[PDB]
């Protein structure tokens, strides 16, 4: 975030030799250029969009730029809490809970009850084996996501968090009005993953309970999902989904063809060079053998 | 891009359950917030950003939605460019130069120089085997990057079409300011798999005209990039580099590990549902074991 727009619009637009006659000309005047180029006017946003076609730099790459050439969000929120949740620092996320406090925006009350949720998780966790959570927080996130139609990214990452917390009716229910944000969001390069991810969670947590009919709905979800305009930016995923229809076949009794399948993905991720990933989802795979007594 | 700002930002945070209050404290008054809600203001850039912030949704995702969950780009050239290019179709390339033209931007010219050079290229073939080029178009492409010192991804973009327009010293010269620029972008989920893609294409040309200690150069770098930060939307692009690194252990008389390698990276893409790359890359291999001479 730590990088005025104008200012780096100059530095772009003198890299490329161009002038401010052939920028500017009929979006704003000669004085409001030089005026912008100074950090002296705010822009507004139609304009802005205008005078970045003019220099060949999509908005989303000027953001890229400007936040000198660290993140795609303003708002980290959901990366930093990932990489803390990821490597368990309960210090840290405090630190995150201290700092969205002291702004107190009204509705970052279920980012907060999902931080406050992951600290008395994590910390029970490191007084016991299993967790010991607040009916408060669970009661916050269930009523933010109750009675909304239609969900942005925001809402998915919240019901990824959240979904344990649900009696299976409403999951089931949160689940369809995801599903119509999904049909909207496959075709975006960053809504795609986060389906992707969403998804092989589901399938994961699915075929563990037993609920096979169920796992292979949304198996079929992430396979579409993973496949969607046959995007190359999702490889990583059709590896999960030959990996969770490998343990869907084992459960159905196609037992040699799902384990074949299932070890070909693991190998597949080494080849990869995915070596962590490959290891992770070798315990899942022994795991799975042994509690369905796989042989 | 068929799709006011301010009325999607309603739209939004209605379905959130947000209030105006809640939404525009502190960043704008209340009737100036009426007044954008209707249309009637227009909004500068660093209030919008505060805006999103306060509805949870990031810039990009904004866009996305208000483009009606199409485009993550404004400007469509390169979309539409590389769909056209990939199905030849010269007729609608004409189409994309004439309305480009309307606008008439001066610095269009490169792009204009582009289509150009693709029109009388795909023309040429249709009439022949082989290609029939103006000097006028490559010297205005050569002209646009030459003495540039950073680059955006416009360059790389531009640079990736033009290169076979410049002398090996020219192309290696821009291939060192383009590696700059890779080393910002490696971090960027857009950029990455651009510049994957672009030394994928370079590695491939570097084989077939045997500069092996170049291609190894360039395979280093496709593997770099799409191991970047341990990337999940990299991996299809991790089965490329394999399938060169195979390629090129051939040529380095590791024959039957080489060979080994490409023919596994051929059998996973098409384990992931990548059928027609596979089959792209059965045709590379078979032409290359038969130039190179190989059994």
């Known amino acids: 975030h730590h990088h005025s727009y104008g200012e780096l619009i100059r530095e772009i ?18 004085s409001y250029a030089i005026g912008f180029e100074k950090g002296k006017h705010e822009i507004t946003l139609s304009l802005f969009e205008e005078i970045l076609k003019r220099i060949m730099v999509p908005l989303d790459e000027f953001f890229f730029i400007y936040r000198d050439f660290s993140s795609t969000e303003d708002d980290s929120f959901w990366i930093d809490f990932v990489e ?46 299993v967790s010991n959570i607040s009916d408060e927080y669970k009661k916050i996130i269930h009523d933010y996501l109750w009675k909304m139609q239609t969900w942005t990214l925001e809402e998915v990452r919240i019901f990824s968090n ?68 046959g995007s190359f930016n999702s490889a990583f995923y059709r590896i999960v989904a030959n990996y969770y229809q490998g343990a869907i076949w084992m459960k159905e009794g196609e037992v040699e063809k799902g384990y074949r399948q ?26 799975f053998l042994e509690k369905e007594n796989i042989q």
Chains 1, 2 share one sequence.
Request: with cysteine.
């Open 262 to 287: 299932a070890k070909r993905a693991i190998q597949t991720w080494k080849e990869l060079h995915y070596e962590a990933i490959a290891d992770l989802y070798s315990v899942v795979l022994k795991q």
């Open 162 to 229: 959240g979904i344990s917390f649900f009696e299976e009716e409403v999951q089931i229910h949160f689940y369809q009005i995801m599903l119509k944000s999904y049909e909207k969001y496959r075709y975006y390069d960053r809504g795609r993953l986060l389906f992707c991810h969403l998804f092989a969670n589901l399938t994961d947590e699915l075929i563990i309970q037993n609920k096979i009919n169920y796992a292979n709905l949304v198996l079929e979800k992430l396979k579409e999902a993973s496949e969607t305009s």
């Open 13 to 30: 637009r003198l890299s490329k030799g161009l002038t401010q006659k052939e920028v500017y000309t009929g979006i704003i005047s000669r």
């Open 84 to 129: 803390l949740s990821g490597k368990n620092d309960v210090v840290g996320m405090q630190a995150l809970l201290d700092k969205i406090t002291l702004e107190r925006t009204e509705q970052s009350e279920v980012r907060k009850a999902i931080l406050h949720t992951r600290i008395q998780t994590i910390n029970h966790y490191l007084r016991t084996n």
